[PDB]
Amino acid sequence: MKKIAVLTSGGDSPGMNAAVRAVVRTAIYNEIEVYGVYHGYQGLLNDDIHKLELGSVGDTIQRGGTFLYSARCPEFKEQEVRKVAIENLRKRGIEGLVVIGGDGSYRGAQRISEECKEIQTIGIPGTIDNDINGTDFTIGFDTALNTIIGLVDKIRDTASSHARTFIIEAMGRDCGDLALWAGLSVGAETIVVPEVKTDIKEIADKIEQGIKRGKKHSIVLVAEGCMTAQDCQKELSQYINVDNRVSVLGHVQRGGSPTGADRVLASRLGGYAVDLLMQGETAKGVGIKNNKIVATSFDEIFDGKDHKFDYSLYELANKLSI
Amino acid sequence: MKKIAVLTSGGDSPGMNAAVRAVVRTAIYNEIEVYGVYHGYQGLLNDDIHKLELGSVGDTIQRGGTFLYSARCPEFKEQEVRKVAIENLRKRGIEGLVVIGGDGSYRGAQRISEECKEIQTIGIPGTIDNDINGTDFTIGFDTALNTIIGLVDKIRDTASSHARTFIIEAMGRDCGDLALWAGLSVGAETIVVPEVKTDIKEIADKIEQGIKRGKKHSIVLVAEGCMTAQDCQKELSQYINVDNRVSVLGHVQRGGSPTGADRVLASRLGGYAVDLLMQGETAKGVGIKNNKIVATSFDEIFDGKDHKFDYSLYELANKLSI
Ligand SMILES: Nc1ncnc2c1ncn2[C@@H]1O[C@H](COP(=O)(O)OP(=O)(O)O)[C@@H](O)[C@H]1O
Ligand SMILES: Nc1ncnc2c1ncn2[C@@H]1O[C@H](COP(=O)(O)OP(=O)(O)O)[C@@H](O)[C@H]1O
Numbered sequence: 095m096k097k098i099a100v101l102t103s104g105g106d107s108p109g110m111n112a113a114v115r116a117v118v119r120t121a122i123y124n125e126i127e128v129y130g131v132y133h134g135y136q137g138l139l140n141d142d143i144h145k146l147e148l149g150s151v152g153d154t155i156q157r158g159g160t161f162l163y164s165a166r167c168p169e170f171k172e173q174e175v176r177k178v179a180i181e182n183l184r185k186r187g188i189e190g191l192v193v194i195g196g197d198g199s200y201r202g203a204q205r206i207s208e209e210c211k212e213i214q215t216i217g218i219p220g221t222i223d224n225d226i227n228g229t230d231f232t233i234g235f236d237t238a239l240n241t242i243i244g245l246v247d248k249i250r251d252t253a254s255s256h257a258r259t260f261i262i263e264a265m266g267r268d269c270g271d272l273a274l275w276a277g278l279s280v281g282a283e284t285i286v287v288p289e290v291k292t293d294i295k296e297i298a299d300k301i302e303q304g305i306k307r308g309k310k311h312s313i314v315l316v317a318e319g320c321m322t323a324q325d326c327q328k329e330l331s332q333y334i335n336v337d338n339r340v341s342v343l344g345h346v347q348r349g350g351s352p353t354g355a356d357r358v359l360a361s362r363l364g365g366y367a368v369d370l371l372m373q374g375e376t377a378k379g380v381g382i383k384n385n386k387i388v389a390t391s392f393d394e395i396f397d398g399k400d401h402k403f404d405y406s407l408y409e410l411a412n413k414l415s416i
Numbered sequence: 417m418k419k420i421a422v423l424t425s426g427g428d429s430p431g432m433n434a435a436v437r438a439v440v441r442t443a444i445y446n447e448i449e450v451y452g453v454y455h456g457y458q459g460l461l462n463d464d465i466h467k468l469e470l471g472s473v474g475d476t477i478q479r480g481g482t483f484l485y486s487a488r489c490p491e492f493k494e495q496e497v498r499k500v501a502i503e504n505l506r507k508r509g510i511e512g513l514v515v516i517g518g519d520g521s522y523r524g525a526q527r528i529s530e531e532c533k534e535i536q537t538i539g540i541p542g543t544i545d546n547d548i549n550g551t552d553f554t555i556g557f558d559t560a561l562n563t564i565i566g567l568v569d570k571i572r573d574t575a576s577s578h579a580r581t582f583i584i585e586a587m588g589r590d591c592g593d594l595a596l597w598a599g600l601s602v603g604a605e606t607i608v609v610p611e612v613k614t615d616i617k618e619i620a621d622k623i624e625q626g627i628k629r630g631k632k633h634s635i636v637l638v639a640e641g642c643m644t645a646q647d648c649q650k651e652l653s654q655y656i657n658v659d660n661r662v663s664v665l666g667h668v669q670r671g672g673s674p675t676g677a678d679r680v681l682a683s684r685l686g687g688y689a690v691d692l693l694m695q696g697e698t699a700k701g702v703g704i705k706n707n708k709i710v711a712t713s714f715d716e717i718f719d720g721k722d723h724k725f726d727y728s729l730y731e732l733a734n735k736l737s738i
């Protein structure tokens with residue numbers, strides 16, 4: 095394991111920079127040369143590959159986004175195209191590739207490893223969504239959670255004293271975790287997520303009761319994976335009079351400096367990735383499961399869903415809002 | 417389990433309010449009457465005990481500190497004095513007591529349960545220190561971590577461009593966790609903690625080398641449990657010329673709104689406390705261990721130290737700083 099490359103792929107997630115830093119510094123500590131691939135898999139195809147030194151990652155742990163950049167590279171689904179990426183790595187003597195991103199990014203990594211036995215690949219779970227098999231938390235989830243709290247606070251702090259209902263749309267893709275943790279965190283009356291069947295009539299009856307008791311500044315928090323905040327508002331207005339602030343929090347949830355949870359998680363997983371490469375491992379995603387740092391094969395990562403939405407935490411939220 | 421009391425004891429920790437809220441709302445959901453004890457165990461002795469309603473805990477999840485208040489009540493170490501506290505609860509028909517605080521607070525709770533079979537007691541681990549057996553994280557640790565990051569950022573953002581070394585004193589009592597996570601989080605050159613033997617000469621040789629390479633704004637982060645920032649500075653100056661900003665972060669580390677990690681942890685553990693009371697349990701502290709919500713007997717909590725300082729995370733920090 096003499097040369098490693100590292101790349102960031104998919105949407106930004108706070109802590110990507112910290113993960114790159116840990117890969118680069120850990121590599122060099124172990125006398126491994128490390129190359130940064132810029133613009134995700136696009137850079138891999140364009141040969142936008144450059145040697146990194148200790149100082150290339152200075153002043154990065156606190157930075158949001160990714161100093162390598164990212165792209166969407168849909169042509170990487172094609173085998174012929176991946177051949178060029180594999181040649182750009184191999185001509186450089188690269189023996190290991192670390193990919194930081196979500197589930198889609200991992201698929202690129204699996205293909206590489208299948209199509210070139212000479213390159214070991216390791217995935218690091220850089221996404222806000224919390225939706226990667228075999229890690230309990232992804233790098234960025236904790237940051238995104240606090241970002242949502244802060245955004246909610248500003249919406250309410252800047253609103254009319256008389257606004258009764260804030261319908262706020264959270265990210266998460268197909269996973270309701272962000273909406274659930276954020277909802278509980280801000281004291282939401284209602285949480286709308288793809289894992290629970292949404293009962294509009296119940297939700298509006300709750301709004302209306304509280305509006306009847308003079309309750310102001312109530313919040314419905316909505317995972318984008320279930321519906322948009324505007325559709326929620328439109329659907330509620332089929333029972334009750336309501337539209338008081340539809341808010342789409344949007345891509346800012348991906349921005350901003352990672353929290354300490356994310357910095358530390360990123361750091362542990364970036365170093366572990368390099369350890370695994372040195373140990374001969376391949377085709378695994380790294381994570382934290384039951385408070386242990388672990389590696390799971392991409393096959394198992396993609397074989398199912400690998401554990402439930404926490405319905406009991408959903409229930410606790412609803413109990414606390416009563 | 418018809419009546420519960422709840423109190424906060426020891427230093428403030430972000431998320432105490434969220435824990436009280438979860439106890440109160442969960443109790444009432446289950447048709448249990450819940451009484452707030454004000455000023456910790458002092459209120460217990462003064463009979464500063466009042467019925468809470470659903471609304472008594474409104475607008476509290478985001479609030480730092482504790483709306484019940486806290487005290488230090490050293491006389492509670494005396495059995496005769498505890499008799500008065502027990503009588504104030506029993507005369508009210510209180511059947512369960514939830515104590516939120518650190519290890520010292522738990523001791524009060526154990527005694528109560530030993531001295532009055534009619535009151536069940538449950539501890540909730542409200543402290544920044546991270547130093548309670550059988551939970552991996554205490555309520556406030558995550559908040560304190562981010563508070564430290566923010567404080568470090570402001571020290572550096574407001575300093576002379578030419579300051580070379582910031583010696584910053586972190587809380588933690590006898591546990592180095594806060595200093596370790598914060599250190600890694602801010603990219604500290606050095607981390608001084610009670611679990612690792614401090615090598616001053618090594619530390620100064622590292623400062624001096626980097627100062628020689630033109631490195632500015634370096635940080636030594638110091639757990640109060642190992643030494644003060646000023647003693648560290650004095651000890652370093654026995655090898656090298658240095659004193660560039662001694663900073664004692666101080667009690668503010670206990671203040672401020674809990675992070676989402678803390679709000680959610682607090683909430684889960686407050687509800688669990690009430691569940692346990694309803695189930696007949698007593699003399700247990702609740703926690704999160706290996707990502708599972710668990711209850712551990714006070715005897716086991718006080719029997720040892722129950723798991724290591726993470727030397728491997730300490731090592732990773734040092735590797736990343738090189
Ligand atoms: N099935 C796949 N096979 C190969 N490459 C893929 C696959 N899915 C995604 N990728 C690569 O990963 C990039 C990012 O994936 P995407 O699904 O947008 O993000 P995420 O990593 O967050 O799931 C895509 O643009 C593409 O280059
Ligand atoms: N051994 C003990 N027996 C009975 N009460 C105790 C004991 N230790 C502490 N307490 C009670 O808990 C209060 C807070 O404890 P302290 O040690 O200050 O905080 P923490 O709960 O953070 O450890 C003390 O003022 C006292 O009332």
